[PDB]
Design an enzyme around this catalytic site. Structure first.
Site, PDB file in Angstrom:
ATOM      1  N   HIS A 165     -12.319   8.758   0.774  1.00 46.92           N
ATOM      2  CA  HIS A 165     -11.888   7.907   1.942  1.00 46.92           C
ATOM      3  C   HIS A 165     -12.050   8.765   3.364  1.00 46.92           C
ATOM      4  O   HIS A 165     -11.825   9.995   2.930  1.00 46.92           O
ATOM      5  CB  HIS A 165     -10.704   7.418   1.619  1.00 46.92           C
ATOM      6  N   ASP A 178     -11.303  11.014  -6.177  1.00 48.84           N
ATOM      7  CA  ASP A 178     -11.785   9.683  -6.286  1.00 48.84           C
ATOM      8  C   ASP A 178     -13.142   9.477  -6.040  1.00 48.84           C
ATOM      9  O   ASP A 178     -13.633   8.602  -5.909  1.00 48.84           O
ATOM     10  CB  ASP A 178     -10.910   8.688  -5.244  1.00 48.84           C
ATOM     11  N   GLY A 198      -2.259   4.178   3.324  1.00 47.49           N
ATOM     12  CA  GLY A 198      -2.965   4.386   2.125  1.00 47.49           C
ATOM     13  C   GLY A 198      -2.332   5.183   1.183  1.00 47.49           C
ATOM     14  O   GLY A 198      -2.842   6.165   0.774  1.00 47.49           O
ATOM     15  N   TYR A 255      -7.898   8.909  -9.226  1.00 47.15           N
ATOM     16  CA  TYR A 255      -7.145   7.734  -9.941  1.00 47.15           C
ATOM     17  C   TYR A 255      -7.817   7.487 -11.567  1.00 47.15           C
ATOM     18  O   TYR A 255      -6.937   6.873 -12.010  1.00 47.15           O
ATOM     19  CB  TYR A 255      -7.224   6.602  -9.326  1.00 47.15           C
ATOM     20  N   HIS A 283      -4.073  10.226   5.242  1.00 47.66           N
ATOM     21  CA  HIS A 283      -3.947   8.651   6.036  1.00 47.66           C
ATOM     22  C   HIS A 283      -2.777   8.469   6.611  1.00 47.66           C
ATOM     23  O   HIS A 283      -2.925   7.740   7.820  1.00 47.66           O
ATOM     24  CB  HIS A 283      -3.994   7.689   4.957  1.00 47.66           C
ATOM     25  N   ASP A 303       0.961  -1.153   0.000  1.00 48.21           N
ATOM     26  CA  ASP A 303      -0.105   0.227   0.154  1.00 48.21           C
ATOM     27  C   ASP A 303       0.755   1.237  -0.282  1.00 48.21           C
ATOM     28  O   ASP A 303       0.404   2.202  -0.381  1.00 48.21           O
ATOM     29  CB  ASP A 303      -1.040   0.127   1.288  1.00 48.21           C
TER      30      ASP A 303
HETATM   31  O1  M8G Z   1      -7.720   7.721  -2.121  1.00 48.59           O
HETATM   32  C1  M8G Z   1      -7.038   7.403  -1.194  1.00 48.59           C
HETATM   33  C2  M8G Z   1      -6.410   6.139  -0.741  1.00 48.59           C
HETATM   34  C3  M8G Z   1      -6.338   5.025  -1.683  1.00 48.59           C
HETATM   35  C4  M8G Z   1      -5.898   3.972  -1.302  1.00 48.59           C
HETATM   36  C5  M8G Z   1      -5.859   3.317  -0.143  1.00 48.59           C
HETATM   37  C6  M8G Z   1      -5.277   2.178   0.416  1.00 48.59           C
HETATM   38  C7  M8G Z   1      -4.673   1.327  -0.709  1.00 48.59           C
HETATM   39  C8  M8G Z   1      -4.438   1.625  -1.959  1.00 48.59           C
HETATM   40  C9  M8G Z   1      -5.219   2.914  -2.128  1.00 48.59           C
HETATM   41  N1  M8G Z   1      -5.021   3.233  -3.702  1.00 48.59           N
HETATM   42  C10 M8G Z   1      -5.749   2.507  -4.571  1.00 48.59           C
HETATM   43  O2  M8G Z   1      -6.411   1.435  -4.484  1.00 48.59           O
HETATM   44  C11 M8G Z   1      -5.529   2.773  -6.092  1.00 48.59           C
HETATM   45  C12 M8G Z   1      -6.496   2.659  -7.079  1.00 48.59           C
HETATM   46  C13 M8G Z   1      -6.334   3.037  -8.576  1.00 48.59           C
HETATM   47  C14 M8G Z   1      -5.100   3.444  -8.864  1.00 48.59           C
HETATM   48  C15 M8G Z   1      -3.951   3.818  -8.069  1.00 48.59           C
HETATM   49  C16 M8G Z   1      -4.335   3.309  -6.800  1.00 48.59           C
HETATM   50  O3  M8G Z   1      -3.061   3.560  -5.572  1.00 48.59           O
HETATM   51  C17 M8G Z   1      -2.296   2.520  -5.271  1.00 48.59           C
HETATM   52  C18 M8G Z   1      -2.454   1.264  -5.618  1.00 48.59           C
HETATM   53  C19 M8G Z   1      -2.053   0.196  -5.242  1.00 48.59           C
HETATM   54  C20 M8G Z   1      -1.054   0.400  -4.136  1.00 48.59           C
HETATM   55  C21 M8G Z   1      -0.747   1.738  -3.649  1.00 48.59           C
HETATM   56  C22 M8G Z   1      -1.466   2.710  -4.123  1.00 48.59           C
HETATM   57  N2  M8G Z   1      -7.351   8.196  -0.068  1.00 48.59           N
HETATM   58  O4  M8G Z   1      -8.035   9.687  -0.345  1.00 48.59           O
HETATM   59  K     K Z   2     -13.524  12.236   3.280  1.00 48.87           K
HETATM   60 ZN    ZN Z   3      -9.431   8.658  -1.538  1.00 45.36          ZN
END
Ligand code: M8G
Ligand code: K
Ligand code: ZN
Ligand code: K
Length: 365
Positions: free
Chosen positions: A168, A255, A139, A294, A131, A89
């Site tokens: 989130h 998002d 996150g 994203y 986060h 993450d």
């Molecule tokens: O939007 C967010 C946090 C998102 C998030 C939280 C925990 C784990 C992964 C997250 N990110 C995603 O799911 C995500 C979705 C689509 C494209 C890139 C993304 O970033 C990543 C994906 C994988 C690993 C780390 C970051 N906070 O406002």
């Molecule tokens: K929020």
């Molecule tokens: Zn978010």
């Protein structure tokens, strides 16, 4: 001092572009803002890089030092990284400390402009990493720039309102101020079994002297502009009256926007803009932040549009030509279209939530 500050430099955008997972996003956002000539109506300010002293006002030295080591080399020969929240993450990739410091500095610089009366609104679209905990990445947030900004603002402003419109729950920021009444945090977010980060139910209200100074609005999939604004405005009215803030930090993660891989909310930038307008009409010192988002083109569309709103401009539907024009196909327009999915938000449930909150804010003095 009526003109918004826009935190920017090529080196800063280059640094923010270097995130795998959202590559070139910072560039797409700036590039599009520039291409509607909106920078010409803002004060461009080069961000500083944050010092270890500055970053440590929130984060622990153990954590910062670890982040630094991992940044130099990599994560081979560091099985300690799990302790500090690095992993799938928050990948332990090279150069992340510099990235962290750039972003923290950017947000601080923004806050400093506001303190200095340089502007009433200051913008760092590549910030909002809400986060991160004092000693733990989380996150995809390595460093909580929002918190650092809030802390900088506290030098001049006694009471600060944090509003978090990302999909989130803004847990990192909440947790940092859960025990104080000097900062109120308000988050609208999806709350759902299994959905990250799992915190933020409406009964999350803060603790000790901070009890009632955390506001949380749990929302289900498929919410749209009109209903979201009703919720948002209903809540922010109560908050303004009850908390009477002197400054505002506003996280606007995109998002929530229709078309995002998150595929949860069904919003458009217009809906979010209305929420933004409402905060702007308060005329307070306002620190504007990005965050999640994203679908990269859509994220740029959204933030570009919102910069428009900040400036009181109406932007043309037609996307201007510029470096990344191709990514706005096939229609090449600024507006975003809601998906055809159901709104899973039962009106009675929403009304319960809103009343509960108004009750909580009665207590606030
Ligand atoms: O939007 C967010 C946090 C998102 C998030 C939280 C925990 C784990 C992964 C997250 N990110 C995603 O799911 C995500 C979705 C689509 C494209 C890139 C993304 O970033 C990543 C994906 C994988 C690993 C780390 C970051 N906070 O406002
Ligand atoms: K929020
Ligand atoms: Zn978010
Ligand atoms: K609080």
């Amino acid at each position: 001092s009526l003109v918004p500050v826009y935190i920017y430099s090529p080196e800063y955008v280059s640094m923010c572009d270097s995130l795998a997972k959202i590559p070139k996003r910072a560039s797409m956002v700036h590039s599009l803002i520039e291409a509607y000539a909106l920078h010409k109506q803002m004060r461009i300010v080069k961000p500083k890089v944050a010092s270890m002293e500055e970053m440590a006002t929130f984060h622990t030295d153990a954590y910062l030092q670890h982040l630094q080591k991992v940044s130099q080399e990599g994560d081979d020969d560091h099985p300690d990284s799990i302790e500090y929240g690095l992993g799938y993450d928050c990948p332990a990739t090279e150069g992340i400390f510099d990235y962290a410091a750039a972003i923290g500095g950017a947000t601080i610089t923004a806050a400093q402009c506001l303190i200095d009366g340089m502007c009433k609104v200051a913008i760092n679209w590549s910030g909002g990493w809400h986060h991160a905990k004092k000693d733990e990445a989380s996150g995809f947030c390595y460093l909580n720039d929002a918190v650092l900004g809030i802390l900088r603002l506290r030098r001049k402003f006694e009471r600060i309102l944090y509003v978090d419109l990302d999909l989130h729950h803004g847990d990192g920021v909440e947790d940092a101020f859960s025990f104080t009444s000097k900062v109120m945090t308000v988050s609208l977010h999806k709350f759902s079994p299994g959905f990250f980060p799992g915190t933020g139910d409406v009964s999350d209200v803060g603790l000790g002297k901070g009890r009632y100074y955390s506001v949380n609005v749990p929302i289900q999939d498929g919410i749209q502009d009109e209903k979201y604004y009703q919720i948002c405005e209903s809540v922010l009215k109560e908050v303004y009256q009850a908390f009477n803030p002197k400054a505002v930090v506003l996280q606007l993660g995109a998002d929530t926007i229709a078309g995002d891989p998150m595929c949860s909310f069904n919003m458009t930038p217009v809906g979010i803009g209305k929420c933004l307008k409402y905060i702007l009409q308060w005329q307070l010192a306002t620190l504007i932040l990005g965050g999640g988002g994203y679908n990269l083109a859509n994220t740029a569309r959204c933030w570009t549009y919102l910069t428009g709103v900040i400036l009181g401009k109406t932007l043309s539907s037609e996307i201007p030509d510029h470096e990344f024009f191709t990514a706005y196909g096939p229609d090449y327009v600024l507006e975003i279209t809601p998906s055809c999915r159901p709104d899973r938000n039962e009106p009675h449930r929403i009304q319960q939530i809103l009343n509960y909150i108004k009750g909580n804010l009665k207590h606030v003095v």
